Ligand binder design. Structure first.
Ligand SMILES: *[C@@H]1O[C@H](CO)[C@@H](O[C@@H]2O[C@H](CO)[C@@H](O)[C@H](O)[C@H]2NC(C)=O)[C@H](O)[C@H]1NC(C)=O
Ligand SMILES: CN(C)C(=O)CNC(=O)/C=C/c1ccc(C(F)(F)F)cc1
Ligand SMILES: *[C@@H]1O[C@H](CO)[C@@H](O)[C@H](O)[C@H]1NC(C)=O
Lengths: 597, 32
């Protein structure tokens, strides 16, 4: 609809599209099998991002409260954009940076924002992988290293922190992070974290050495194993005590959470992380299919699987949350029963406690804790605590602690590695298509330079303050660009390339022209939701002081986390991470409209 | 424990990955 001149002779014709298919036999990489393509999409849209952030968002906000908006926007906003990313990659036979420049030469900023975004999300994920594999390396010892504390000089007590806090808290914050007091306080690099980070980058380079002719072989173990281990954690989790108390907690939501602006803003951002939309990997992966592949069927299958896996993962995370909560409630009670049993020298079990405590009425001297179970269930976990302080502590209670621990980290490592394949796809290919390195050099040279590059950038997440540094990318900072790109990708394929031409091309490939559902979303519904969502982001999340949780042993109520405001200079870092890729789309356009004229 | 058990797991994994890395590069240098 916008005045696009001479779009053809920049894009391939449908006639050439049917022929060039053979021309791309060696000119471009091609999926050996559809299986191999479907497994890749499965991992990129159902790996970390769908299985890591989701249960954290569900634990925060409300359990079932947050799940309703997510499944509304998953289809009203995610299915459309996923079907639009797959079809446009399959038609223009080029990666993200190629697909946007082709539609209009001033839209090349849209493929550099996607490359930067992909880079940053990989840098974030890689760290998570490094922590996962630190934990996976320590889980080959009968008594797992986070099931006890180091002894003190008296040997009668454990390290004060470990004593006041939890063994799992001490293994996370002290033995793994050696975490500092503040983001401002930044110590030297913790050599063992650096060593695990090296291992992470090394394994990823090995699996992505030679583009998709090495990752397609990898996704046979990397997109299956994670789903054959998460159904065992569902059986185990469901067979845990008090587990069904947590599942009900998840399905008994407070409707007043659904009527909060912040819940919706988190669900939308989350849709574009669940499906790796606006990372640009998917466009590239769909561009190696047959020109006559049914991408509508693929988008719907991926979305169903991606939607259904989100709920299956919150049912495994809540079985464990209610298991721990039940244990804590039983302890509180038991400890309360002990306070009075010893004090009044006396049969105080479950029902008797309430009736007998009334008879005992040293009651004043006796100090009694309040056991609620619902309070135990409604106790939020510090970021990344669900995996390193909630799931780890629950496994230490399982009969074969080492077996489970190992399996739990191998699942998180595999669905991380899977996710990283797409994240790396979306930074290698744009960098090939800029023709930045001399094209005589092999593909392996360019893939190692970015592995080392991102490896060197990842030293900041290896300091004492590194965890604080990593929790900045969990702010609106890492979400603002995704919304801008996703909206621009939809607007460009509908009001620039033309939805009429797009529909005709879809008809040429799959056979039929897309349904009214696809028409009503692409044209109005989908774009509007994105407009309303990111505007709400700017009015709510951005319009809020950025605060983080610090772990200070020397703090009143030490065991309780302390929330403090970031020092002003970290707005520079946020301003940059958000604008760098969000102002690229406008600011390369303006460059192309002042050089041409 | 005389040697930290993670280091001897880390070592096995890192050794296997670097062996994989050199095999894949030579494989690619011999397929061109
Ligand atoms: C369900 O969602 C509502 C709305 O977010 C929660 O209401 C909050 O409750 C706390 C504790 O009483 C108050 O400090 C907040 O100010 C409330 N927020 C609002 C906007 O009313 C509610 O707590 C959630 N679930 C529960 C456990 O009731
Ligand atoms: C801070 N942040 C933004 C996060 O996203 C943290 N995510 C987590 O801490 C995620 C835990 C997690 C644990 C178990 C499973 C299982 F179900 F697979 F077992 C999944 C996810
Ligand atoms: C942890 O960091 C401190 C500096 O903050 C350093 O002195 C110490 O050797 C480090 N080692 C530990 C305790 O992991």
């Amino acid at each position: 609809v916008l005045p696009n001149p001479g779009l053809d002779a920049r894009i391939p014709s449908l006639a050439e599209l049917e022929t060039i298919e053979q021309e791309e036999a060696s000119s471009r990489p091609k999926w050996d099998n559809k299986a191999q393509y479907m497994l890749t999409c499965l991992g990129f849209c159902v790996g970390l991002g769908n299985v890591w952030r989701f249960p954290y968002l569900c634990q925060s906000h409300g359990g079932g409260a947050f799940m309703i908006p997510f499944l509304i926007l998953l289809v009203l906003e995610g299915i459309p954009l996923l079907y639009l990313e797959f079809a446009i990659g399959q038609r223009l036979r080029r990666g993200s940076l190629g697909v946007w420049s082709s539609i209009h030469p001033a839209l090349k900023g849209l493929g550099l924002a996607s490359m930067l975004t992909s880079f940053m999300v990989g840098l974030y994920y890689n760290t998570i992988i490094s922590w996962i594999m630190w934990y996976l390396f320590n889980s080959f010892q009968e008594p797992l290293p986070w099931s006890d504390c180091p002894l003190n000089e008296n040997q009668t007590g454990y390290v004060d922190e470990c004593a006041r806090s939890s063994p799992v808290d001490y293994f996370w914050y002290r033995e793994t992070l050696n975490i500092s007091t503040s983001i401002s306080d930044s110590g030297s690099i913790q050599w063992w974290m650096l060593l695990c980070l090296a291992c992470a980058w090394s394994v990823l380079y090995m699996c992505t050495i030679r583009g998709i002719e090495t990752t397609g072989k990898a996704v046979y173990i990397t997109s299956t194993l994670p789903y054959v281990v998460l159904t065992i954690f569902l059986i185990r989790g469901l067979t845990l005590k008090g587990a069904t108390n947590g599942i009900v907690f998840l399905f008994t939501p407070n409707v007043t959470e659904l009527a909060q602006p912040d819940t919706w803003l988190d669900a939308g951002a989350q849709v574009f992380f669940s499906f790796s939309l606006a990372f640009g990997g998917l466009i590239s992966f769909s561009s190696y299919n047959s020109v006559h592949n049914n991408c509508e069927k693929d988008s719907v299958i991926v979305s169903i699987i991606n939607g259904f896996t989100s709920v299956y993962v919150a049912i495994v995370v809540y079985s464990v949350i209610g298991f721990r909560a039940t244990q804590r409630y039983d302890d509180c009670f038991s400890t309360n029963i002990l306070t009075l049993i010893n004090g009044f020298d006396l049969n105080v079990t479950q029902e008797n406690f309430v009736d007998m405590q009334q008879r005992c009425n040293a009651y004043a001297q006796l100090v009694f804790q309040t056991c609620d179970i619902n309070a135990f269930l409604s106790e939020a976990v510090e970021g990344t605590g669900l995996a390193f302080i909630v799931f780890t502590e629950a496994i230490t209670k399982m009969p074969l602690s080492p077996l489970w621990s190992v399996l739990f980290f191998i699942m998180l490592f595999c669905l991380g590695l899977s996710s990283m394949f797409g994240n790396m796809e979306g930074v290698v290919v744009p960098l090939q298509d800029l023709r930045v390195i001399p094209p005589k050099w092999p593909k392996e040279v360019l893939t190692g330079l970015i592995c080392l590059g991102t490896f060197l950038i990842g030293f900041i997440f290896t300091l004492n303050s590194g965890q604080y540094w990593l929790s900045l990318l969990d702010s609106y900072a890492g979400s603002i660009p995704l919304l801008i790109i996703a909206f621009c990708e939809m607007f460009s394929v509908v009001y620039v390339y033309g939805v009429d031409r797009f529909n005709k091309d879809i008809e040429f490939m799959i056979g039929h022209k897309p349904n009214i559902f696809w028409q009503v979303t692409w044209r109005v519904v989908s774009p509007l939701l994105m407009l309303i969502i990111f505007l709400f982001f700017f009015v709510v999340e951005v319009s809020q002081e950025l605060t983080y949780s610090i772990w200070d042993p020397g703090y009143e109520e030490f065991p309780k986390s302390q929330k403090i405001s970031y020092p002003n200079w970290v707005y520079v870092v946020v301003v940059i991470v958000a604008g760098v890729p969000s102002l690229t789309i406008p600011g390369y356009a303006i460059y192309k409209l002042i050089r041409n004229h | 424990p005389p040697v930290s058990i993670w280091l001897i797991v880390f070592g096995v994994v890192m050794g296997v990955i670097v062996v994989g890395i050199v095999i894949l590069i030579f494989t690619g240098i011999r397929d061109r």
